[PDB]
Amino acid sequence: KKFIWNSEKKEFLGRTGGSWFKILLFYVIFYGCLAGIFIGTIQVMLLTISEFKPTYQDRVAPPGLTQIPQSQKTEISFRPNDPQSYESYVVSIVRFLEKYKDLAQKDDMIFEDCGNVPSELKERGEYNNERGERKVCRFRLEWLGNCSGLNDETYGYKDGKPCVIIKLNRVLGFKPKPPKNESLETYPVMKYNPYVLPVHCTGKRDEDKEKVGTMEYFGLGGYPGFPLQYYPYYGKLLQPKYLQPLMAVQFTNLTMDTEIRIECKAYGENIGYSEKDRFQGRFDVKIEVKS
């Protein structure tokens, strides 16, 4: 009963040729209409959103805090001797900082020298297209001391006492607000509380806080944070080739051959946290320089 393939009375795979043509033509017209309808509605949807601002921005309320070595488990395990053990790290650091070289930021028509001192926020009008393509403040690698160097094509980084720079999640129209001068016990930090978003790293428990001996922060002019002169963001369409602020963190006194946990928590009023997302506001890393 399963050899209905053909017969001398014209049937193929179950039906005739003229029926195959009728059904195929119907399905093509039907699905063509369905595609046109879906496309028209998706076009109306495209007409309900603008090009300079996302309609809903509440799902990114607390900005994240990422690092340069995007580890498979936020763990930095390598050997201070073997150069191939830490190749995966250095490769990502060089590729990340490849857009911050002095040669990359050479056009004066799209780059603006912010300054050697963190200043107030820079609002370049409204988010419309009435103005031309906004300028992006420059950020030379020299600001991250001891984690930039004047190395060749391969940034000879730190084998012993590694470097891990932190970055604030780029958000459109987000205006960072550092904590008030009434700091509720924020782990010794400089007195430059008004024009920089503080970020302080620490251990996680009584063990990690003891294993991690000394940490050295590097930033714009020497402050452990992000300068307000680089915010807010005006979208990729209006500000292409934008360079968000960077801040490096080096762990000098580490206990070699021991996996220790570090939590770099960014402080501020407009900076939220989440017990479910360990990256919203805060940031975790498991460093282990096994010799």
Binding site: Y56, Q57, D58, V60, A61, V171, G173, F174, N270
Partner: protein, 32 residues
Amino acid sequence: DPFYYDYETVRNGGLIFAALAFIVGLIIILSK
């Protein structure tokens, strides 16, 4: 700030809708 959404009001409205639609359906299947 545009980084805030009154989710409690929408959530409350959705729960009231779910309650009313269910009690209305119950009245529908209880024709008396």
